[PDB]
Symmetry: C2
Subunit: 92 residues, 2 copies
Protein backbone atom coordinates (compact mmCIF):
# COMPACT_ATOMS: atom_id res chain seq x y z
CA UNK A 1 0.00 0.00 0.00
CA UNK A 2 1.34 3.40 -1.04
CA UNK A 3 1.22 4.94 2.43
CA UNK A 4 3.01 1.95 3.98
CA UNK A 5 5.84 2.27 1.47
CA UNK A 6 5.97 6.03 2.03
CA UNK A 7 6.15 5.88 5.82
CA UNK A 8 8.77 3.13 5.64
CA UNK A 9 10.77 5.44 3.37
CA UNK A 10 10.51 8.35 5.81
CA UNK A 11 12.00 6.14 8.53
CA UNK A 12 14.71 4.91 6.16
CA UNK A 13 15.84 8.48 5.47
CA UNK A 14 15.86 9.31 9.19
CA UNK A 15 17.98 6.20 9.83
CA UNK A 16 20.46 7.23 7.12
CA UNK A 17 21.14 10.59 8.75
CA UNK A 18 20.64 9.85 12.46
CA UNK A 19 22.66 6.64 12.18
CA UNK A 20 25.79 8.46 11.03
CA UNK A 21 27.16 8.87 14.54
CA UNK A 22 26.14 9.35 18.15
CA UNK A 23 22.53 8.94 19.25
CA UNK A 24 20.67 6.97 16.59
CA UNK A 25 17.38 8.56 17.69
CA UNK A 26 18.47 12.19 17.28
CA UNK A 27 19.54 14.66 14.61
CA UNK A 28 21.26 17.98 14.90
CA UNK A 29 19.43 20.85 13.21
CA UNK A 30 22.39 21.05 10.82
CA UNK A 31 21.78 17.43 9.84
CA UNK A 32 18.06 18.11 9.44
CA UNK A 33 18.87 21.07 7.20
CA UNK A 34 21.20 18.91 5.10
CA UNK A 35 18.56 16.18 4.91
CA UNK A 36 15.82 18.53 3.70
CA UNK A 37 18.09 20.30 1.21
CA UNK A 38 19.42 17.06 -0.29
CA UNK A 39 16.43 14.74 -0.04
CA UNK A 40 13.76 17.27 -1.07
CA UNK A 41 15.98 19.31 -3.37
CA UNK A 42 13.31 20.09 -5.96
CA UNK A 43 10.69 21.32 -3.49
CA UNK A 44 10.11 25.09 -3.50
CA UNK A 45 7.53 27.35 -1.83
CA UNK A 46 4.13 28.17 -3.33
CA UNK A 47 3.29 31.72 -4.20
CA UNK A 48 2.14 32.89 -0.76
CA UNK A 49 4.37 30.64 1.34
CA UNK A 50 7.71 32.23 0.57
CA UNK A 51 8.18 34.21 3.78
CA UNK A 52 7.11 31.40 6.11
CA UNK A 53 9.35 28.99 4.20
CA UNK A 54 12.28 31.40 4.50
CA UNK A 55 11.74 31.84 8.24
CA UNK A 56 11.54 28.07 8.62
CA UNK A 57 14.80 27.40 6.75
CA UNK A 58 16.68 30.20 8.52
CA UNK A 59 15.76 28.80 11.94
CA UNK A 60 17.46 25.50 11.07
CA UNK A 61 20.55 27.33 9.84
CA UNK A 62 20.84 29.45 12.98
CA UNK A 63 19.76 26.95 15.64
CA UNK A 64 22.39 24.35 16.53
CA UNK A 65 20.50 22.34 19.12
CA UNK A 66 20.78 18.59 18.58
CA UNK A 67 17.52 17.39 20.10
CA UNK A 68 15.66 16.89 16.83
CA UNK A 69 13.85 13.60 17.32
CA UNK A 70 11.89 11.55 14.81
CA UNK A 71 8.62 13.35 15.60
CA UNK A 72 10.26 16.74 15.03
CA UNK A 73 11.81 15.49 11.79
CA UNK A 74 8.40 14.40 10.53
CA UNK A 75 6.88 17.71 11.62
CA UNK A 76 9.47 19.44 9.47
CA UNK A 77 8.37 17.36 6.48
CA UNK A 78 4.77 18.36 7.16
CA UNK A 79 5.71 22.04 7.29
CA UNK A 80 7.54 21.70 3.97
CA UNK A 81 4.32 20.32 2.50
CA UNK A 82 2.36 23.31 3.76
CA UNK A 83 4.94 25.58 2.13
CA UNK A 84 5.73 23.74 -1.08
CA UNK A 85 2.82 21.53 -2.08
CA UNK A 86 0.09 23.12 -4.21
CA UNK A 87 -2.66 21.35 -2.26
CA UNK A 88 -2.05 23.71 0.65
CA UNK A 89 -1.68 26.89 -1.42
CA UNK A 90 -4.87 28.33 0.06
CA UNK A 91 -4.67 26.75 3.51
CA UNK A 92 -4.67 29.14 6.50
CA UNK B 1 14.31 10.79 -4.81
CA UNK B 2 12.75 8.32 -2.39
CA UNK B 3 11.81 10.91 0.22
CA UNK B 4 10.19 13.20 -2.37
CA UNK B 5 8.02 10.34 -3.60
CA UNK B 6 7.16 9.37 -0.03
CA UNK B 7 6.13 12.84 1.09
CA UNK B 8 4.08 13.33 -2.08
CA UNK B 9 2.33 10.06 -1.22
CA UNK B 10 1.56 11.20 2.32
CA UNK B 11 -0.17 14.29 0.89
CA UNK B 12 -2.02 12.17 -1.66
CA UNK B 13 -3.49 10.00 1.08
CA UNK B 14 -4.52 13.06 3.11
CA UNK B 15 -6.24 14.51 0.03
CA UNK B 16 -8.10 11.24 -0.57
CA UNK B 17 -9.69 11.34 2.90
CA UNK B 18 -9.94 15.06 3.61
CA UNK B 19 -11.33 15.71 0.12
CA UNK B 20 -14.35 13.47 0.65
CA UNK B 21 -16.55 16.29 1.90
CA UNK B 22 -16.50 19.57 3.80
CA UNK B 23 -13.23 21.28 4.67
CA UNK B 24 -10.50 19.91 2.42
CA UNK B 25 -7.85 20.82 5.01
CA UNK B 26 -9.39 18.90 7.92
CA UNK B 27 -10.16 15.35 9.01
CA UNK B 28 -12.41 14.06 11.73
CA UNK B 29 -10.69 11.69 14.15
CA UNK B 30 -13.03 9.00 12.82
CA UNK B 31 -11.64 9.56 9.32
CA UNK B 32 -8.09 9.55 10.67
CA UNK B 33 -8.82 6.25 12.41
CA UNK B 34 -10.21 4.79 9.18
CA UNK B 35 -7.20 6.07 7.24
CA UNK B 36 -4.64 4.52 9.59
CA UNK B 37 -6.52 1.21 9.83
CA UNK B 38 -6.94 0.87 6.06
CA UNK B 39 -3.77 2.47 4.72
CA UNK B 40 -1.36 1.01 7.31
CA UNK B 41 -3.28 -2.23 7.85
CA UNK B 42 -0.23 -4.47 8.26
CA UNK B 43 1.50 -2.29 10.86
CA UNK B 44 1.48 -3.65 14.41
CA UNK B 45 3.19 -2.60 17.66
CA UNK B 46 6.68 -3.75 18.67
CA UNK B 47 7.21 -5.75 21.80
CA UNK B 48 7.33 -2.85 24.27
CA UNK B 49 4.95 -0.49 22.52
CA UNK B 50 1.65 -2.30 22.88
CA UNK B 51 0.20 -0.21 25.69
CA UNK B 52 1.12 3.15 24.16
CA UNK B 53 -0.23 1.96 20.81
CA UNK B 54 -3.51 0.84 22.38
CA UNK B 55 -3.91 4.14 24.21
CA UNK B 56 -3.22 6.00 20.97
CA UNK B 57 -5.81 4.05 18.96
CA UNK B 58 -8.46 4.25 21.67
CA UNK B 59 -8.16 8.04 21.82
CA UNK B 60 -9.00 8.20 18.11
CA UNK B 61 -12.02 5.95 18.60
CA UNK B 62 -13.40 7.95 21.54
CA UNK B 63 -12.57 11.49 20.44
CA UNK B 64 -14.90 12.88 17.77
CA UNK B 65 -13.31 16.28 17.30
CA UNK B 66 -12.89 17.22 13.64
CA UNK B 67 -9.94 19.60 13.84
CA UNK B 68 -7.31 17.10 12.68
CA UNK B 69 -5.17 19.11 10.28
CA UNK B 70 -2.38 17.92 8.01
CA UNK B 71 0.28 18.46 10.68
CA UNK B 72 -1.69 16.38 13.19
CA UNK B 73 -2.22 13.67 10.58
CA UNK B 74 1.52 13.49 9.94
CA UNK B 75 2.20 13.46 13.68
CA UNK B 76 -0.07 10.42 13.91
CA UNK B 77 2.03 8.68 11.24
CA UNK B 78 5.16 9.48 13.23
CA UNK B 79 3.64 8.03 16.40
CA UNK B 80 2.73 4.84 14.53
CA UNK B 81 6.38 4.54 13.51
CA UNK B 82 7.48 4.85 17.12
CA UNK B 83 5.02 2.08 18.02
CA UNK B 84 5.31 -0.26 15.06
CA UNK B 85 8.69 0.15 13.38
CA UNK B 86 11.56 -1.95 14.72
CA UNK B 87 14.02 0.95 14.43
CA UNK B 88 12.38 2.57 17.45
CA UNK B 89 11.96 -0.57 19.56
CA UNK B 90 14.47 0.67 22.13
CA UNK B 91 13.76 4.39 21.79
Amino acid sequence: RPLEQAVAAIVCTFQEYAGRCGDKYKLCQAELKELLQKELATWTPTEFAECDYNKFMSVLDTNKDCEVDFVEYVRSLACLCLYCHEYFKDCP
